[PDB]
C-alpha cells in the first residue's frame, strides 16, 4: 500500500506542478490536496521510484522535481517532499 502511495504522491505532485504553471482557483484546490496528503501521511505513520512514476507519466518533469528537491535539501524524504509541497502551497498566490 505504501509504495504505490508514494508513487501516486509523486505522480500527482508532477501533475500539480504542471497544472500550476500559470500561477507563477487552483491554489485553493492544491492546498486542499496537500492537506489531504498530509492527513494521509499522518494516518500512515525517491530516485528508486523512477519506474512506477514514469510508467504513469512518460515525460521526463521527473528531472525537474528531483533537481528541485536536491536544491531544497542542499521516512525523511517523505517529510522533505511534504515540506516542499507546503512551501509551494504557501507561495501559490
Amino acid at each position: 500500500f505504501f509504495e504505490m502511495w508514494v508513487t501516486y504522491l509523486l505522480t500527482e505532485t508532477i501533475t500539480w506542478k504542471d497544472k500550476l504553471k500559470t500561477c507563477m482557483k487552483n491554489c485553493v484546490c492544491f492546498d486542499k490536496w496537500v492537506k489531504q496528503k498530509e492527513d494521509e501521511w499522518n494516518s500512515i505513520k525517491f530516485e528508486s521510484f523512477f519506474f512506477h512514476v514514469m510508467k504513469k507519466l512518460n515525460k521526463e518533469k521527473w528531472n525537474k522535481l528531483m533537481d528541485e528537491l536536491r536544491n531544497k535539501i542542499e521516512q525523511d524524504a517523505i517529510e522533505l517532499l511534504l515540506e516542499y509541497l507546503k512551501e509551494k502551497s504557501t507561495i501559490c498566490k
Epitope: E3, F50, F51, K55, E60
Partner: antibody, heavy 119, light 110 residues
Framework: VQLVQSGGALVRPGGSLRLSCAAS????????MNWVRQAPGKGLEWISY????????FYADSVEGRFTISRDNTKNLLWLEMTSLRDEDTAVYYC??????????????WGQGTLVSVS | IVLTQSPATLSLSPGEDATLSCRAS??????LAWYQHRPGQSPRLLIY???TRATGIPARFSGSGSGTEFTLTVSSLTSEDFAVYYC????????????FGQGTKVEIKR
C-alpha cells in the same frame, strides 16, 4: 539496429578506463541503455542503467561509487567511466538496449562485447 | 530476487525439445525474461514477460510461468541452441533489481 563498443583494453588496478558504445540504426534518445558484466566463468551480471535522458541512473550494489554511466544522445555514445578498478573487475562488458516501457526492464539488443582485464 | 536455474548442464540430442526452470525466491509475477548466450556471440533476448516472444525470435522459443516457478521450453534443438540460458527478473519493487540466474546449459549428449 547495431551497438558497436570500443574494444578491450589492459588497465592496471586502481586505474581508470572509459568504455564506449556507439549505437546506430535507431533513435538513441528513445531507448534506455544498460551495461551488463560477465566475469570469466561466473555468468551475466547487470551493473548499470541510464534512462532516455540522464534523469535516472541505477547501479548494482557492487559498483556504486566506483562506476558512472553517461550517455550522449546527440552523438549516440554510451559511456561507463570506470574508477578504482579492483581485481574482480576482469570481465567482459556488454552494452545492452532496453525495450520501450519502463516496467519491461529487459535487455533487448546487445553490443559486441569488451574484455576489460586488470593486472 | 534469487533466481535458480535447476537444469544447469543438460546433455540432450539435437532436434529434440528441452525444458528449463527458473525458480524465484519471492513472488515476482510475469516480470521475468530469458536470454541465450550462444558461444562466440553476444546474448540475445528470447522471452521478456515469461510467456511472450521477442522480435526476431522463432516460434519454437516458448515459455510459461507467472508466480515463483518459471519454465522455458525450446523445441527442435538446432546447432545454435546448445548455449547457456539465463533468466532475469525485473520485478517492480523499490529499489529495482536486475538479477540473473546462474545459467543453465544445454549440451549435446553422446
Amino acid at each position: 539496429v547495431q551497438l558497436v563498443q570500443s574494444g578491450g583494453a589492459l588497465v592496471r588496478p586502481g586505474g581508470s578506463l572509459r568504455l564506449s558504445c556507439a549505437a546506430s540504426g535507431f533513435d538513441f534518445s528513445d531507448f534506455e541503455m544498460n551495461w551488463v558484466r560477465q566475469a570469466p566463468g561466473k555468468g551475466l551480471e547487470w551493473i548499470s542503467y541510464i534512462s532516455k535522458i540522464s534523469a535516472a541512473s541505477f547501479y548494482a550494489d557492487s559498483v556504486e561509487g566506483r562506476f558512472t554511466i553517461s550517455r550522449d544522445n546527440t552523438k549516440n555514445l554510451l559511456w561507463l567511466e570506470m574508477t578504482s578498478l579492483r581485481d574482480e573487475d576482469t570481465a567482459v562488458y556488454y552494452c545492452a538496449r532496453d525495450l520501450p516501457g519502463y516496467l519491461e526492464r529487459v535487455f533487448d539488443l546487445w553490443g559486441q562485447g569488451t574484455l576489460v582485464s586488470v593486472s | 530476487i534469487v533466481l535458480t536455474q535447476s537444469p544447469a548442464t543438460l546433455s540432450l540430442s539435437p532436434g529434440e525439445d528441452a525444458t528449463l526452470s527458473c525458480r524465484a525466491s519471492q513472488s515476482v509475477g510475469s516480470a521475468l525474461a530469458w536470454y541465450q548466450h550462444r558461444p562466440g556471440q553476444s546474448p540475445r533476448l528470447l522471452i521478456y514477460d515469461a510467456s511472450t516472444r521477442a522480435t526476431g525470435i522463432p516460434a519454437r522459443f516458448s515459455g510459461s510461468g507467472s508466480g515463483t516457478e518459471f519454465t522455458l521450453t525450446v523445441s527442435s534443438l538446432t546447432s545454435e541452441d546448445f548455449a547457456v540460458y539465463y533468466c532475469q527478473e525485473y520485478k517492480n519493487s523499490v529499489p529495482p533489481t536486475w538479477t540473473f540466474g546462474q545459467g543453465t546449459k544445454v549440451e549435446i549428449k553422446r
